[PDB]
Design a protein around this ligand. Structure first.
Ligand SMILES: CC(=O)N[C@@H]1[C@@H](O[C@@H]2OC(C(=O)O)=C[C@H](O)[C@H]2O)[C@@H](O)[C@@H](COS(=O)(=O)O)O[C@H]1O
Ligand SMILES: CC(=O)N[C@@H]1[C@@H](O[C@@H]2OC(C(=O)O)=C[C@H](O)[C@H]2O)[C@@H](O)[C@@H](COS(=O)(=O)O)O[C@H]1O
Ligand code: MG
Length: 966
């Protein structure tokens, strides 16, 4: 407390706090005849004393303090977010009081004299009170009196008060509770309950007790975002620092507990130096509950009976202090928003300490408390399945905490009802196809958060959802097979699109820090061992491969010999992210487009700032292993030159997202993505269309970009390339990788190039091999630039300068001012000898491939090495072709004539939905030349031709094997 008024316009954000650790601490206070005010060091919140107020019913005391109460608009301008001036204090009751305390605000008040509010006194322990002075009183500039009036209908009593504070707070976070009513309320959980009920039986109770033990086993025998401490010396040292002591007739003294979000009410950055020093003695709840967990884990593992007893006493004392500090049912503590960050390991600690809380008679208090603060999570914790139930962050941050809370329910019948309902909730969450862009799994195996396929969020959700299924396995509470099947699809998909990191195109807003399947490994064991017919040999074989374990090691893990999965081979279409994956030997190629339903990039205030081209028809090649070790190095990376993309080469100031905060740029039509044939061949169709009027986006930048992938090779073609400036700085990147001692060699036309710097220009019939063994044969280009150069770039978070040496090659489209084009072929197993053979084959009337059409309506590529034809119908069309006559929608078609059969696949990569609507299936009529007979594809001979009817659901290709009719 200073001599200045609260909310001093001159220093609006500086809190005024009565903590009584200063000179003449009751200077500003006076009492009527019927009240006595003492300082007590028996308990306190801030500094070592609190106000002891003894009273008869109806007696007041007055705090004399000038308040220049700002409007909400003034407070919000001073801070820069929606704000309100708040009055807050802490009070302690040693016994409950059947009545209300009245707090009145006015000018020159005494016991017998504007606005005010009431605090119900029927409780024990510390409670916090926090009200908006503008919004929560039942305030003219001249307020100088705050009058605390003891209840009129209670003959005597006594209350401890501390830390009376005037502050500017976030306008969202003064919550109602059992003591104070505010304009804001977080309603309590109302648990859903599924019928029929499971009975309390010895079998059902044992299954419950087994689930709890299985959770204990997972937390005592390595979690992300858990600060594990197994050293008892360290645990007792951190505990002793808390200075917790049991008090005489009940409660505790010890350092004050506050959450990371609660501190906002202080505006700590603006505290005067006296106040800050006291505030710095607080303990952050996250750290305290982490200590409770590490102690509970040490207790469970501890062999020495004396140490084991000490760990238990430490855990129960920390529990009693936590409850006495007002973390109990009905105590909002003004707010507990983002409760999970502060409490997640408290929930888990109760599993380990469940018998110890039972014996100490704390289970019901701790359950009531955790249930109350969980009300923040009522949308999930109520356990009614809804469109939002497939939340991927929930699976990561909250699902095991939720199960722990249910297991802490003291009644047996209720506990069984809650866990039965939980099993139903998790089954629905893992089974349902959420509408539109909502979080969750999808039928092609993609997994969505922030309204798109997002491995950075899905990978942690896979790990914990697999663990949940495994914890409930082989009990009456086991997750339904439909949820197991869907999660299997998503996790086998993740194995296909990672190597073992997801590519740059799947990195979301963290390019060059891709999630790795290595972090999800244990999930494959947990899902493999929770199969109806366990172990699932596919998931078990993937666990062994991703965790680098041998066939020899398999019997002990799975109870039978399982060969570690070899890397997946062939082509897989994932239109949930308008991508596909081509795999050959140890290489993965991520082919990525974008469209109305697939954002190109997530760009935030400090994330992925130069990410505009992340999905621009990219084709990133990755060998099994570290992408950094293959030269995907952020430092000096030219953000314009994403492998395979057609881009405008911009200065980074113009490539930077035009929005200062968030942009998730969606495309201009539904159609763009991939398709597959026989699980082996693929095609990408990318319609590059820019917005009519977005700053820094050339509205006339266009391209049609197709790729056909088969076996060791990919054929890349482009047409209809344009910009506002005759294709000036328009480029297609063949490759870009750092130069290192392991990545030092390029081959050009049989010559090894190692010099740095180096520039040259190549044309049709030339070839290159990058340092990762990818060959590029130029089959149509006027001008391919190759560069080994020092590059200056900037890092994607804070735009700070970076530099590095890179090998790259790109096509310069400026030589063709209108409707520029390209063709080139990649060999994934290139050697100088093999590239010499491919170049000679290309020179023999192109024995490699044939483009049968390349225009704005259709791209048709015949691969003569694989004998496969890909058809990208950018528009519906009739064509001239041996196989395909007509396609009535934008679609990707693929054919393979083998001996006695024609195999035809078809799909539209268009998901046929919005951010709100469920995807519905698209009917595609594909007419083929000639008479055929035979898959859910329908066929009908119609004159000399055959009509195929495909159903394209969520961009999932269908195919049919046809044989000729006489
Ligand atoms: C606040 C912000 O920039 N973006 C919002 C998202 O917040 C980010 O994502 C998450 C997260 O758990 O997903 C936590 C952090 O606040 C921040 O990194 C998020 O609030 C989304 C909504 O998610 S979605 O319903 O899945 O779309 O909205 C973003 O703009
Ligand atoms: C896509 C995304 O930001 N996802 C969030 C995580 O961020 C990724 O992973 C990590 C990391 O070390 O975990 C760091 C980078 O921010 C990014 O590659 C991460 O912030 C977690 C935090 O989880 S929480 O504390 O465990 O609940 O949330 C991710 O899913
Ligand atoms: Mg104090």
């Amino acid at each position: 407390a200073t001599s200045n008024p609260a909310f001093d316009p001159k220093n609006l954000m500086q809190s005024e706090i009565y903590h009584f650790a200063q000179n003449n601490p009751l200077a500003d206070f006076s009492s009527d005849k019927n009240s006595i005010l003492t300082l007590s060091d028996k308990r306190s919140i801030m500094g070592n004393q609190s106000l002891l107020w003894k009273w008869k019913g109806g007696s007041s005391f007055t705090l004399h303090k000038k308040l220049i109460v700002p409007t909400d608009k003034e407070a919000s301008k001073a801070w820069g977010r929606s704000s309100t001036p708040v009055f807050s204090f802490w009070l302690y009751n040693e016994k409950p009081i059947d009545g209300y305390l009245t707090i009145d605000f006015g000018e020159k008040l005494i016991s017998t004299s504007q606005a005010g509010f009431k605090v119900k006194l029927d409780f024990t322990g510390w409670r916090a009170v926090g009200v908006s002075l503008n919004n929560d009183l039942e305030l003219g500039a001249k307020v100088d009196s705050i009058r605390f009036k003891a209840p009129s209908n209670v003959s005597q009593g006594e209350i401890y008060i501390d830390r009376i504070m005037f502050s500017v707070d976030d306008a969202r976070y003064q919550w109602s509770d059992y003591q104070v009513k505010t304009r804001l309320s977080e309603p309590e959980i109302q648990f859903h309950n599924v019928k029929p009920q499971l009975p309390v039986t010895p079998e059902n109770l044992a299954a419950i007790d087994l689930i709890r033990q299985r959770l204990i086993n997972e937390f005592v025998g390595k979690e992300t975002n858990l600060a594990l401490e197994e050293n008892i010396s360290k645990l007792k040292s951190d505990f002793d620092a808390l200075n917790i002591h049991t008090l005489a007739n009940g409660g505790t003294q010890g350092r004050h507990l506050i959450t990371d979000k609660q501190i906002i009410i202080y505006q700590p950055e603006n505290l005067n130096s006296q106040d800050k020093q006291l505030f710095d003695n607080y303990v952050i709840l996250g750290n305290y509950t982490t200590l409770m967990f590490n102690i509970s884990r040490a207790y469970v593992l501890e062999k020495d009976p004396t140490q084991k007893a000490q760990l238990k006493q430490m855990y129960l004392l920390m529990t009693k202090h936590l409850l006495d500090q007002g973390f109990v049912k009905g105590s909002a503590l003004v707010t507990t928003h983002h409760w999970g960050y502060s409490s997640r390991w408290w929930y888990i600690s109760t599993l380990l300490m469940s018998d110890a809380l039972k014996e100490a008679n704390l289970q019901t208090q701790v359950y009531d408390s955790l249930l109350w603060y969980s009300r923040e999570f009522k949308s999930s914790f109520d356990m009614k399945v809804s469109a939002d139930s497939s939340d991927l962050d929930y699976f990561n941050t909250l699902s095991r905490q939720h199960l722990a809370l249910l297991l802490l329910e003291p009644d047996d019948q209720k506990r069984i009802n809650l866990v039965n309902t939980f099993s139903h909730y998790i089954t629905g969450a893992l089974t349902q196809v959420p509408p539109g862009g909502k979080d969750g799994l999808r039928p092609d195996g993609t997994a969505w958060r922030h309204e798109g396929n997002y491995p950075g969020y899905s990978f942690p959700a896979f790990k914990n959802a697999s663990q949940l299924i495994y914890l409930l396995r082989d009990t009456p509470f086991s997750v339904g097979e439909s949820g197991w099947n869907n999660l299997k699809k998503a996790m086998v998909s993740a194995w296909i699109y990672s190597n073992p990191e997801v590519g740059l195109p799947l990195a979301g807003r963290h390019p060059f820090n891709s999630p790795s399947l290595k972090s999800v490994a244990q999930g494959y064991y947990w899902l493999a061992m929770s199969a109806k017919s366990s172990p699932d040999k596919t998931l078990a074989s993937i666990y062994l491969a991703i965790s680098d374990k041998t066939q020899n090691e398999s019997t002990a893990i799975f109870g039978e010999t399982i060969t570690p999965a070899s890397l997946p081979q062939g082509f897989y279409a994932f239109n949930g992210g308008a991508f596909g994956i081509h795999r050959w030997q140890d290489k993965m190629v991520t082919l990525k487009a974008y469209n109305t339903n697939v954002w190109s990039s997530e760009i935030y205030n400090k994330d992925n700032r130069y990410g505009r081209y992340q999905s621009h028809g990219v084709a990133q090649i990755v060998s099994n292993g570290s992408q950094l070790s293959q030269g995907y190095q952020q430092e000096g990376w030219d953000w314009n030159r994403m492998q395979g993309a057609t881009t405008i080469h911009l200065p980074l100031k113009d490539l930077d997202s035009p929005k200062p905060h968030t942009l998730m740029q969606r495309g201009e039509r539904g159609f763009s993505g991939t398709s597959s044939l026989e699980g082996q061949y693929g095609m990408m169709a990318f319609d590059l269309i820019y917005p009519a009027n977005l700053e820094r986006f050339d509205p006339n930048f266009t391209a049609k970009k197709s790729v056909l992938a088969a076996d060791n090779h990919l054929i890349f073609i482009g047409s209809n390339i344009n910009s506002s400036d005759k294709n000036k700085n328009v480029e297609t990147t063949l490759f870009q990788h750092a130069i290192t001692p392991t990545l030092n060699t390029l081959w050009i036309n049989g010559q090894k190039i190692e010099n740095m710097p180096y520039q040259t220009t190549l044309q049709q019939g030339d070839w290159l091999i990058d340092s990762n063994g990818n060959g590029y044969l130029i089959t149509q280009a006027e001008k391919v630039n190759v560069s080994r150069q020092h590059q200056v770039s900037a890092e994607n978070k804070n735009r700070q300068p970076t530099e590095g040496n890179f090998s790259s090659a790109w096509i310069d489209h400026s030589t063709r001012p209108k409707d520029a084009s390209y063709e080139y072929m990649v060999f994934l197993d290139a050697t100088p000898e093999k590239m010499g053979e491919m170049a000679q084959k290309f020179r023999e009337n192109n024995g490699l491939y044939q483009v049968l059409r390349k225009d704005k309506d259709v791209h048709i590529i015949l691969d003569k090495l694989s004998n496969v034809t890909g058809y990208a119908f950018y528009q519906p069309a009739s064509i001239e072709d041996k196989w395909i006559k007509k396609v009535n929608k934008p679609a990707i078609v693929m054919t393979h004539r083998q001996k006695d059969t024609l195999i035809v696949s078809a799909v539209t990569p268009d998901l046929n939905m919005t951010r709100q609507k469920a995807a519905t299936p698209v009917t595609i009529n594909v007419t083929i030349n000639g008479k055929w007979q035979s898959s859910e594809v329908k066929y009908q001979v119609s004159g000399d031709n055959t009509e195929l009817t495909f159903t394209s659901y969520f961009g999932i290709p269908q195919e049919i094997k046809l044989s000729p009719l006489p």
